[PDB]
Amino acid sequence: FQWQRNIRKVR
Numbered sequence: 001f002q003w004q005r006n007i008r009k010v011r
């Protein structure tokens, strides 16, 4: 909804 294709910010 807010983001694109990265939910968990680790990669």
Ligand SMILES: *C(=O)CCCCCCCCCCC
Binding pocket: 001, 002, 003, 004
């Ligand atoms: C917010 O924009 C992050 C991306 C979410 C995608 C969810 C799936 C959207 C399609 C739903 C169809 C019923």
